[PDB]
Amino acid sequence: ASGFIEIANKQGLTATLLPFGATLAKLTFPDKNGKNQDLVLGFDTIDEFEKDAASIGKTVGRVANRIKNSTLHFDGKQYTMTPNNGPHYLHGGPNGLGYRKWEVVRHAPESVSFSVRANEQDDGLPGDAKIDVTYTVNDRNQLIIEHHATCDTPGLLALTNHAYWNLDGSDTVAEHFLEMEADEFVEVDDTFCPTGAIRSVTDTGFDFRSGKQLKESGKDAEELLDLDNDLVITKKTPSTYLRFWSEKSGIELSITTSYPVIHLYASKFLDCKGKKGEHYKANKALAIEPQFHSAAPNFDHFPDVSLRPGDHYCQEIVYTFSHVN
């Protein structure tokens, strides 16, 4: 058996990790009323996490999101996996990184690092890789997630963190405000698999450039937010890219990442017994997943996510917690 690992700074920021799936189990931070609030969904027990299928707080890999039709071409060779989500291959498959027990290579009062190895035999994806993920909290009230990796054999590697966020405990995050520096988004089909097209956010329900409440996303016949797309980060050349907050709890979350996109999932298909024995329902939280474009391995015009011998996969996500004053 394993066990929850806790890290924390000196200002009231605590994070609880789990070796299994290198998961972010909990993240507590005092609200405007000085009351501690767990900002991420989860489970009160370890086994519940090992049985979860919604990838709650997990470190996802080797390839986050979908591989169109469970097939791809790598270095002139075709790789075909067994579908695990519709006709596609989602989050690295049933034996993806999120479903494996990572080794604890470092643990200190404010930081913890996990490591794990994966090759074609483990998940059917090309080559192999030694992956190391670190969670660190600091005096700036930031949670830093570092994603590092190397390989002996050429393959693909595109990770992300699948934590579902809810800053005030509300039944849903429809009232939460969201602001993103994203001019474009990745188009997806009915099965939510990228089509390879990029669409401007202008005049669409995905324009969060002015900061609005999530409840504002068109008008469907289910009154549910079906957010679950890749929002391409507008990055300069010659900084915070996302701000998520709740006027209710007064808690705000800002993010900066090396990744080119941030996948936002409004938790439309959620329905599980979480913390406090609570019953999570539709649009309960907001999954924020900094990552490379979904289905990158299927479209050559999307970022090249190959990881080859001698190179170093190195990405980071910085979450800053504060208050809206």
Side-chain angles (χ1 to χ4, degrees), residues 66-99:
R66 312 171 176 69
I67 292 298
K68 186 170 164 56
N69 298 330
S70 304
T71 314
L72 64 81
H73 300 83
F74 182 74
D75 285 1
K77 191 179 174 190
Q78 188 167 65
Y79 287 82
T80 49
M81 290 68 258
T82 294
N84 74 324
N85 171 281
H88 317 303
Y89 199 59
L90 179 76
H91 303 320
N95 200 44
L97 306 185
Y99 293 113

PDB file of all heavy atoms in Angstrom, residues 66-99:
ATOM      1  N   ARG A  66      -7.053  12.639 -26.539  1.00  0.00           N
ATOM      2  CA  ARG A  66      -7.182  11.645 -27.586  1.00  0.00           C
ATOM      3  C   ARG A  66      -6.243  11.484 -28.758  1.00  0.00           C
ATOM      4  O   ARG A  66      -5.675  12.442 -29.271  1.00  0.00           O
ATOM      5  CB  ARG A  66      -8.592  11.770 -28.166  1.00  0.00           C
ATOM      6  CG  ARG A  66      -9.686  11.828 -27.107  1.00  0.00           C
ATOM      7  CD  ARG A  66     -11.041  12.163 -27.716  1.00  0.00           C
ATOM      8  NE  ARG A  66     -12.099  12.116 -26.714  1.00  0.00           N
ATOM      9  CZ  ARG A  66     -12.227  12.986 -25.716  1.00  0.00           C
ATOM     10  NH1 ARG A  66     -11.362  13.981 -25.581  1.00  0.00           N
ATOM     11  NH2 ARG A  66     -13.216  12.857 -24.844  1.00  0.00           N
ATOM     12  N   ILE A  67      -6.120  10.224 -29.176  1.00  0.00           N
ATOM     13  CA  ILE A  67      -5.305   9.821 -30.312  1.00  0.00           C
ATOM     14  C   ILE A  67      -6.479   9.433 -31.223  1.00  0.00           C
ATOM     15  O   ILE A  67      -7.166   8.443 -30.960  1.00  0.00           O
ATOM     16  CB  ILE A  67      -4.472   8.551 -30.056  1.00  0.00           C
ATOM     17  CG1 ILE A  67      -3.371   8.819 -29.024  1.00  0.00           C
ATOM     18  CG2 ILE A  67      -3.878   8.073 -31.376  1.00  0.00           C
ATOM     19  CD1 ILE A  67      -2.354   9.851 -29.443  1.00  0.00           C
ATOM     20  N   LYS A  68      -6.715  10.221 -32.269  1.00  0.00           N
ATOM     21  CA  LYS A  68      -7.814   9.961 -33.195  1.00  0.00           C
ATOM     22  C   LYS A  68      -7.867   8.546 -33.745  1.00  0.00           C
ATOM     23  O   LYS A  68      -6.923   8.070 -34.373  1.00  0.00           O
ATOM     24  CB  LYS A  68      -7.775  10.962 -34.347  1.00  0.00           C
ATOM     25  CG  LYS A  68      -8.967  10.876 -35.292  1.00  0.00           C
ATOM     26  CD  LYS A  68      -8.975  12.059 -36.262  1.00  0.00           C
ATOM     27  CE  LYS A  68      -9.902  11.805 -37.452  1.00  0.00           C
ATOM     28  NZ  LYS A  68     -11.294  11.482 -37.028  1.00  0.00           N
ATOM     29  N   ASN A  69      -8.991   7.882 -33.490  1.00  0.00           N
ATOM     30  CA  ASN A  69      -9.223   6.513 -33.938  1.00  0.00           C
ATOM     31  C   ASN A  69      -8.189   5.508 -33.446  1.00  0.00           C
ATOM     32  O   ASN A  69      -7.939   4.485 -34.082  1.00  0.00           O
ATOM     33  CB  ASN A  69      -9.337   6.469 -35.463  1.00  0.00           C
ATOM     34  CG  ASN A  69     -10.522   7.291 -35.975  1.00  0.00           C
ATOM     35  OD1 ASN A  69     -11.536   7.424 -35.287  1.00  0.00           O
ATOM     36  ND2 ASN A  69     -10.401   7.833 -37.180  1.00  0.00           N
ATOM     37  N   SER A  70      -7.596   5.798 -32.294  1.00  0.00           N
ATOM     38  CA  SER A  70      -6.600   4.909 -31.716  1.00  0.00           C
ATOM     39  C   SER A  70      -5.485   4.490 -32.664  1.00  0.00           C
ATOM     40  O   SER A  70      -4.930   3.400 -32.519  1.00  0.00           O
ATOM     41  CB  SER A  70      -7.288   3.650 -31.181  1.00  0.00           C
ATOM     42  OG  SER A  70      -8.307   3.976 -30.252  1.00  0.00           O
ATOM     43  N   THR A  71      -5.159   5.345 -33.628  1.00  0.00           N
ATOM     44  CA  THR A  71      -4.103   5.032 -34.578  1.00  0.00           C
ATOM     45  C   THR A  71      -3.290   6.279 -34.902  1.00  0.00           C
ATOM     46  O   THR A  71      -3.832   7.381 -34.952  1.00  0.00           O
ATOM     47  CB  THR A  71      -4.670   4.496 -35.899  1.00  0.00           C
ATOM     48  OG1 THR A  71      -5.681   3.516 -35.621  1.00  0.00           O
ATOM     49  CG2 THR A  71      -3.554   3.858 -36.726  1.00  0.00           C
ATOM     50  N   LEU A  72      -1.992   6.101 -35.118  1.00  0.00           N
ATOM     51  CA  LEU A  72      -1.105   7.209 -35.444  1.00  0.00           C
ATOM     52  C   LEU A  72       0.088   6.678 -36.208  1.00  0.00           C
ATOM     53  O   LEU A  72       0.322   5.469 -36.256  1.00  0.00           O
ATOM     54  CB  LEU A  72      -0.627   7.924 -34.169  1.00  0.00           C
ATOM     55  CG  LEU A  72       0.244   7.153 -33.171  1.00  0.00           C
ATOM     56  CD1 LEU A  72       1.706   7.131 -33.636  1.00  0.00           C
ATOM     57  CD2 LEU A  72       0.143   7.817 -31.804  1.00  0.00           C
ATOM     58  N   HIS A  73       0.834   7.586 -36.817  1.00  0.00           N
ATOM     59  CA  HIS A  73       2.010   7.215 -37.572  1.00  0.00           C
ATOM     60  C   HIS A  73       3.190   7.897 -36.902  1.00  0.00           C
ATOM     61  O   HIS A  73       3.161   9.103 -36.667  1.00  0.00           O
ATOM     62  CB  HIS A  73       1.880   7.670 -39.027  1.00  0.00           C
ATOM     63  CG  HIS A  73       0.700   7.077 -39.735  1.00  0.00           C
ATOM     64  ND1 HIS A  73      -0.571   7.600 -39.630  1.00  0.00           N
ATOM     65  CD2 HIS A  73       0.591   5.980 -40.521  1.00  0.00           C
ATOM     66  CE1 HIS A  73      -1.413   6.851 -40.323  1.00  0.00           C
ATOM     67  NE2 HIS A  73      -0.733   5.860 -40.873  1.00  0.00           N
ATOM     68  N   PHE A  74       4.214   7.120 -36.568  1.00  0.00           N
ATOM     69  CA  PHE A  74       5.392   7.675 -35.925  1.00  0.00           C
ATOM     70  C   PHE A  74       6.646   7.171 -36.619  1.00  0.00           C
ATOM     71  O   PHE A  74       6.889   5.968 -36.667  1.00  0.00           O
ATOM     72  CB  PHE A  74       5.436   7.279 -34.446  1.00  0.00           C
ATOM     73  CG  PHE A  74       6.608   7.848 -33.708  1.00  0.00           C
ATOM     74  CD1 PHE A  74       6.640   9.195 -33.361  1.00  0.00           C
ATOM     75  CD2 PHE A  74       7.709   7.055 -33.412  1.00  0.00           C
ATOM     76  CE1 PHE A  74       7.755   9.743 -32.731  1.00  0.00           C
ATOM     77  CE2 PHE A  74       8.828   7.594 -32.783  1.00  0.00           C
ATOM     78  CZ  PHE A  74       8.851   8.938 -32.443  1.00  0.00           C
ATOM     79  N   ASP A  75       7.436   8.095 -37.155  1.00  0.00           N
ATOM     80  CA  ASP A  75       8.667   7.734 -37.843  1.00  0.00           C
ATOM     81  C   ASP A  75       8.443   6.699 -38.961  1.00  0.00           C
ATOM     82  O   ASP A  75       9.209   5.746 -39.105  1.00  0.00           O
ATOM     83  CB  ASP A  75       9.690   7.219 -36.819  1.00  0.00           C
ATOM     84  CG  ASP A  75      10.304   8.346 -35.975  1.00  0.00           C
ATOM     85  OD1 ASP A  75       9.920   9.523 -36.169  1.00  0.00           O
ATOM     86  OD2 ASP A  75      11.170   8.050 -35.120  1.00  0.00           O
ATOM     87  N   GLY A  76       7.384   6.906 -39.741  1.00  0.00           N
ATOM     88  CA  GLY A  76       7.062   6.006 -40.838  1.00  0.00           C
ATOM     89  C   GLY A  76       6.473   4.664 -40.447  1.00  0.00           C
ATOM     90  O   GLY A  76       6.322   3.770 -41.281  1.00  0.00           O
ATOM     91  N   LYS A  77       6.120   4.519 -39.178  1.00  0.00           N
ATOM     92  CA  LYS A  77       5.551   3.270 -38.700  1.00  0.00           C
ATOM     93  C   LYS A  77       4.191   3.523 -38.065  1.00  0.00           C
ATOM     94  O   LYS A  77       4.019   4.476 -37.307  1.00  0.00           O
ATOM     95  CB  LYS A  77       6.507   2.645 -37.688  1.00  0.00           C
ATOM     96  CG  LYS A  77       6.191   1.227 -37.300  1.00  0.00           C
ATOM     97  CD  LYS A  77       7.231   0.721 -36.321  1.00  0.00           C
ATOM     98  CE  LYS A  77       6.873  -0.653 -35.795  1.00  0.00           C
ATOM     99  NZ  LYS A  77       7.760  -1.027 -34.659  1.00  0.00           N
ATOM    100  N   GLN A  78       3.218   2.674 -38.376  1.00  0.00           N
ATOM    101  CA  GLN A  78       1.894   2.852 -37.810  1.00  0.00           C
ATOM    102  C   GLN A  78       1.731   2.149 -36.473  1.00  0.00           C
ATOM    103  O   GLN A  78       2.167   1.013 -36.294  1.00  0.00           O
ATOM    104  CB  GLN A  78       0.819   2.356 -38.784  1.00  0.00           C
ATOM    105  CG  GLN A  78      -0.597   2.701 -38.333  1.00  0.00           C
ATOM    106  CD  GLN A  78      -1.633   2.498 -39.421  1.00  0.00           C
ATOM    107  OE1 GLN A  78      -1.872   1.379 -39.864  1.00  0.00           O
ATOM    108  NE2 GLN A  78      -2.256   3.589 -39.857  1.00  0.00           N
ATOM    109  N   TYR A  79       1.113   2.844 -35.525  1.00  0.00           N
ATOM    110  CA  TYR A  79       0.878   2.292 -34.198  1.00  0.00           C
ATOM    111  C   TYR A  79      -0.623   2.289 -33.993  1.00  0.00           C
ATOM    112  O   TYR A  79      -1.290   3.302 -34.215  1.00  0.00           O
ATOM    113  CB  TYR A  79       1.563   3.141 -33.129  1.00  0.00           C
ATOM    114  CG  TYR A  79       3.058   2.962 -33.125  1.00  0.00           C
ATOM    115  CD1 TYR A  79       3.856   3.656 -34.024  1.00  0.00           C
ATOM    116  CD2 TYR A  79       3.669   2.049 -32.264  1.00  0.00           C
ATOM    117  CE1 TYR A  79       5.227   3.449 -34.080  1.00  0.00           C
ATOM    118  CE2 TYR A  79       5.042   1.833 -32.309  1.00  0.00           C
ATOM    119  CZ  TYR A  79       5.812   2.539 -33.225  1.00  0.00           C
ATOM    120  OH  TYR A  79       7.161   2.324 -33.304  1.00  0.00           O
ATOM    121  N   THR A  80      -1.151   1.138 -33.595  1.00  0.00           N
ATOM    122  CA  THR A  80      -2.578   0.985 -33.363  1.00  0.00           C
ATOM    123  C   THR A  80      -2.803   0.426 -31.975  1.00  0.00           C
ATOM    124  O   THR A  80      -2.243  -0.607 -31.614  1.00  0.00           O
ATOM    125  CB  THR A  80      -3.186   0.040 -34.396  1.00  0.00           C
ATOM    126  OG1 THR A  80      -2.390  -1.150 -34.472  1.00  0.00           O
ATOM    127  CG2 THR A  80      -3.214   0.707 -35.755  1.00  0.00           C
ATOM    128  N   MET A  81      -3.611   1.131 -31.191  1.00  0.00           N
ATOM    129  CA  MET A  81      -3.910   0.712 -29.835  1.00  0.00           C
ATOM    130  C   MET A  81      -5.359   0.222 -29.749  1.00  0.00           C
ATOM    131  O   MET A  81      -6.131   0.366 -30.705  1.00  0.00           O
ATOM    132  CB  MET A  81      -3.687   1.891 -28.880  1.00  0.00           C
ATOM    133  CG  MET A  81      -2.215   2.296 -28.676  1.00  0.00           C
ATOM    134  SD  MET A  81      -1.307   3.089 -30.206  1.00  0.00           S
ATOM    135  CE  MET A  81      -0.274   1.560 -30.808  1.00  0.00           C
ATOM    136  N   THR A  82      -5.716  -0.382 -28.621  1.00  0.00           N
ATOM    137  CA  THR A  82      -7.076  -0.881 -28.426  1.00  0.00           C
ATOM    138  C   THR A  82      -7.877   0.308 -27.890  1.00  0.00           C
ATOM    139  O   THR A  82      -7.506   0.899 -26.876  1.00  0.00           O
ATOM    140  CB  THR A  82      -7.121  -2.032 -27.386  1.00  0.00           C
ATOM    141  OG1 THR A  82      -6.422  -3.178 -27.897  1.00  0.00           O
ATOM    142  CG2 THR A  82      -8.572  -2.413 -27.068  1.00  0.00           C
ATOM    143  N   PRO A  83      -8.964   0.695 -28.582  1.00  0.00           N
ATOM    144  CA  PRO A  83      -9.777   1.827 -28.128  1.00  0.00           C
ATOM    145  C   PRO A  83     -10.245   1.672 -26.683  1.00  0.00           C
ATOM    146  O   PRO A  83     -10.593   0.573 -26.252  1.00  0.00           O
ATOM    147  CB  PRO A  83     -10.942   1.830 -29.117  1.00  0.00           C
ATOM    148  CG  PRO A  83     -10.302   1.359 -30.374  1.00  0.00           C
ATOM    149  CD  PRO A  83      -9.421   0.217 -29.900  1.00  0.00           C
ATOM    150  N   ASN A  84     -10.257   2.776 -25.937  1.00  0.00           N
ATOM    151  CA  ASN A  84     -10.686   2.746 -24.538  1.00  0.00           C
ATOM    152  C   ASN A  84     -11.716   3.841 -24.247  1.00  0.00           C
ATOM    153  O   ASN A  84     -12.229   3.938 -23.137  1.00  0.00           O
ATOM    154  CB  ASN A  84      -9.484   2.932 -23.617  1.00  0.00           C
ATOM    155  CG  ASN A  84      -8.981   4.360 -23.609  1.00  0.00           C
ATOM    156  OD1 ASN A  84      -9.008   5.041 -24.633  1.00  0.00           O
ATOM    157  ND2 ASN A  84      -8.516   4.822 -22.451  1.00  0.00           N
ATOM    158  N   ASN A  85     -11.993   4.670 -25.246  1.00  0.00           N
ATOM    159  CA  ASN A  85     -12.953   5.762 -25.121  1.00  0.00           C
ATOM    160  C   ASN A  85     -13.530   5.991 -26.503  1.00  0.00           C
ATOM    161  O   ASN A  85     -12.966   6.726 -27.313  1.00  0.00           O
ATOM    162  CB  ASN A  85     -12.263   7.035 -24.619  1.00  0.00           C
ATOM    163  CG  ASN A  85     -13.169   8.252 -24.688  1.00  0.00           C
ATOM    164  OD1 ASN A  85     -13.353   8.849 -25.754  1.00  0.00           O
ATOM    165  ND2 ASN A  85     -13.753   8.617 -23.552  1.00  0.00           N
ATOM    166  N   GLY A  86     -14.667   5.360 -26.770  1.00  0.00           N
ATOM    167  CA  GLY A  86     -15.280   5.512 -28.068  1.00  0.00           C
ATOM    168  C   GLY A  86     -14.293   4.834 -28.992  1.00  0.00           C
ATOM    169  O   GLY A  86     -13.662   3.851 -28.596  1.00  0.00           O
ATOM    170  N   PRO A  87     -14.120   5.328 -30.220  1.00  0.00           N
ATOM    171  CA  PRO A  87     -13.170   4.712 -31.148  1.00  0.00           C
ATOM    172  C   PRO A  87     -11.741   5.235 -30.909  1.00  0.00           C
ATOM    173  O   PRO A  87     -10.781   4.745 -31.499  1.00  0.00           O
ATOM    174  CB  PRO A  87     -13.701   5.152 -32.497  1.00  0.00           C
ATOM    175  CG  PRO A  87     -14.163   6.554 -32.203  1.00  0.00           C
ATOM    176  CD  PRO A  87     -14.909   6.378 -30.890  1.00  0.00           C
ATOM    177  N   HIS A  88     -11.614   6.214 -30.019  1.00  0.00           N
ATOM    178  CA  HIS A  88     -10.310   6.802 -29.720  1.00  0.00           C
ATOM    179  C   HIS A  88      -9.554   6.213 -28.524  1.00  0.00           C
ATOM    180  O   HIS A  88     -10.098   5.414 -27.755  1.00  0.00           O
ATOM    181  CB  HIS A  88     -10.487   8.311 -29.521  1.00  0.00           C
ATOM    182  CG  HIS A  88     -11.397   8.951 -30.526  1.00  0.00           C
ATOM    183  ND1 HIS A  88     -11.186   8.868 -31.884  1.00  0.00           N
ATOM    184  CD2 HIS A  88     -12.526   9.684 -30.364  1.00  0.00           C
ATOM    185  CE1 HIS A  88     -12.144   9.522 -32.519  1.00  0.00           C
ATOM    186  NE2 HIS A  88     -12.969  10.026 -31.619  1.00  0.00           N
ATOM    187  N   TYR A  89      -8.290   6.625 -28.387  1.00  0.00           N
ATOM    188  CA  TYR A  89      -7.405   6.183 -27.308  1.00  0.00           C
ATOM    189  C   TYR A  89      -7.199   7.416 -26.432  1.00  0.00           C
ATOM    190  O   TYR A  89      -6.454   8.332 -26.791  1.00  0.00           O
ATOM    191  CB  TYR A  89      -6.063   5.721 -27.874  1.00  0.00           C
ATOM    192  CG  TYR A  89      -5.270   4.841 -26.942  1.00  0.00           C
ATOM    193  CD1 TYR A  89      -5.805   3.638 -26.470  1.00  0.00           C
ATOM    194  CD2 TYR A  89      -3.966   5.173 -26.567  1.00  0.00           C
ATOM    195  CE1 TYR A  89      -5.072   2.789 -25.665  1.00  0.00           C
ATOM    196  CE2 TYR A  89      -3.215   4.321 -25.749  1.00  0.00           C
ATOM    197  CZ  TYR A  89      -3.780   3.126 -25.307  1.00  0.00           C
ATOM    198  OH  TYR A  89      -3.053   2.252 -24.532  1.00  0.00           O
ATOM    199  N   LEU A  90      -7.848   7.416 -25.273  1.00  0.00           N
ATOM    200  CA  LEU A  90      -7.778   8.526 -24.331  1.00  0.00           C
ATOM    201  C   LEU A  90      -6.829   8.433 -23.142  1.00  0.00           C
ATOM    202  O   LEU A  90      -6.764   7.421 -22.451  1.00  0.00           O
ATOM    203  CB  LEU A  90      -9.192   8.795 -23.806  1.00  0.00           C
ATOM    204  CG  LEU A  90      -9.413   9.906 -22.778  1.00  0.00           C
ATOM    205  CD1 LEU A  90      -9.358  11.253 -23.462  1.00  0.00           C
ATOM    206  CD2 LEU A  90     -10.775   9.717 -22.118  1.00  0.00           C
ATOM    207  N   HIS A  91      -6.106   9.526 -22.908  1.00  0.00           N
ATOM    208  CA  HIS A  91      -5.156   9.624 -21.808  1.00  0.00           C
ATOM    209  C   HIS A  91      -4.184   8.475 -21.629  1.00  0.00           C
ATOM    210  O   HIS A  91      -3.986   7.996 -20.511  1.00  0.00           O
ATOM    211  CB  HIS A  91      -5.903   9.845 -20.487  1.00  0.00           C
ATOM    212  CG  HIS A  91      -6.789  11.050 -20.490  1.00  0.00           C
ATOM    213  ND1 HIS A  91      -6.426  12.238 -21.087  1.00  0.00           N
ATOM    214  CD2 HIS A  91      -8.004  11.262 -19.933  1.00  0.00           C
ATOM    215  CE1 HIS A  91      -7.379  13.133 -20.895  1.00  0.00           C
ATOM    216  NE2 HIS A  91      -8.349  12.566 -20.198  1.00  0.00           N
ATOM    217  N   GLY A  92      -3.580   8.031 -22.725  1.00  0.00           N
ATOM    218  CA  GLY A  92      -2.625   6.942 -22.641  1.00  0.00           C
ATOM    219  C   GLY A  92      -3.151   5.534 -22.453  1.00  0.00           C
ATOM    220  O   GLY A  92      -2.358   4.613 -22.275  1.00  0.00           O
ATOM    221  N   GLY A  93      -4.468   5.363 -22.468  1.00  0.00           N
ATOM    222  CA  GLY A  93      -5.048   4.039 -22.303  1.00  0.00           C
ATOM    223  C   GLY A  93      -5.283   3.578 -20.878  1.00  0.00           C
ATOM    224  O   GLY A  93      -4.969   4.290 -19.934  1.00  0.00           O
ATOM    225  N   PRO A  94      -5.834   2.364 -20.697  1.00  0.00           N
ATOM    226  CA  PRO A  94      -6.117   1.795 -19.376  1.00  0.00           C
ATOM    227  C   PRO A  94      -4.877   1.684 -18.490  1.00  0.00           C
ATOM    228  O   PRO A  94      -4.990   1.682 -17.265  1.00  0.00           O
ATOM    229  CB  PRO A  94      -6.748   0.438 -19.708  1.00  0.00           C
ATOM    230  CG  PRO A  94      -6.131   0.083 -21.010  1.00  0.00           C
ATOM    231  CD  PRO A  94      -6.148   1.396 -21.761  1.00  0.00           C
ATOM    232  N   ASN A  95      -3.701   1.584 -19.106  1.00  0.00           N
ATOM    233  CA  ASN A  95      -2.466   1.482 -18.342  1.00  0.00           C
ATOM    234  C   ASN A  95      -1.611   2.739 -18.550  1.00  0.00           C
ATOM    235  O   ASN A  95      -0.383   2.677 -18.541  1.00  0.00           O
ATOM    236  CB  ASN A  95      -1.671   0.227 -18.720  1.00  0.00           C
ATOM    237  CG  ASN A  95      -0.658  -0.160 -17.648  1.00  0.00           C
ATOM    238  OD1 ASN A  95      -0.968  -0.137 -16.460  1.00  0.00           O
ATOM    239  ND2 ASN A  95       0.550  -0.527 -18.065  1.00  0.00           N
ATOM    240  N   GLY A  96      -2.280   3.874 -18.747  1.00  0.00           N
ATOM    241  CA  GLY A  96      -1.576   5.132 -18.942  1.00  0.00           C
ATOM    242  C   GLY A  96      -0.943   5.541 -17.619  1.00  0.00           C
ATOM    243  O   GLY A  96      -1.193   4.908 -16.584  1.00  0.00           O
ATOM    244  N   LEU A  97      -0.133   6.596 -17.639  1.00  0.00           N
ATOM    245  CA  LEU A  97       0.536   7.071 -16.432  1.00  0.00           C
ATOM    246  C   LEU A  97      -0.413   7.393 -15.281  1.00  0.00           C
ATOM    247  O   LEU A  97      -0.072   7.193 -14.120  1.00  0.00           O
ATOM    248  CB  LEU A  97       1.392   8.307 -16.756  1.00  0.00           C
ATOM    249  CG  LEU A  97       2.407   8.155 -17.896  1.00  0.00           C
ATOM    250  CD1 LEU A  97       3.251   9.423 -17.993  1.00  0.00           C
ATOM    251  CD2 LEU A  97       3.310   6.939 -17.653  1.00  0.00           C
ATOM    252  N   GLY A  98      -1.604   7.886 -15.603  1.00  0.00           N
ATOM    253  CA  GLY A  98      -2.560   8.217 -14.562  1.00  0.00           C
ATOM    254  C   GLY A  98      -3.057   7.000 -13.796  1.00  0.00           C
ATOM    255  O   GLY A  98      -3.576   7.135 -12.684  1.00  0.00           O
ATOM    256  N   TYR A  99      -2.892   5.814 -14.378  1.00  0.00           N
ATOM    257  CA  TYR A  99      -3.339   4.581 -13.727  1.00  0.00           C
ATOM    258  C   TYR A  99      -2.208   3.735 -13.179  1.00  0.00           C
ATOM    259  O   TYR A  99      -2.398   2.553 -12.896  1.00  0.00           O
ATOM    260  CB  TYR A  99      -4.161   3.729 -14.701  1.00  0.00           C
ATOM    261  CG  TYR A  99      -5.470   4.359 -15.087  1.00  0.00           C
ATOM    262  CD1 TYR A  99      -5.701   4.788 -16.391  1.00  0.00           C
ATOM    263  CD2 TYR A  99      -6.467   4.566 -14.138  1.00  0.00           C
ATOM    264  CE1 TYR A  99      -6.891   5.412 -16.740  1.00  0.00           C
ATOM    265  CE2 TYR A  99      -7.662   5.191 -14.478  1.00  0.00           C
ATOM    266  CZ  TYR A  99      -7.867   5.613 -15.776  1.00  0.00           C
ATOM    267  OH  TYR A  99      -9.040   6.254 -16.105  1.00  0.00           O
TER     268      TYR A  99
END
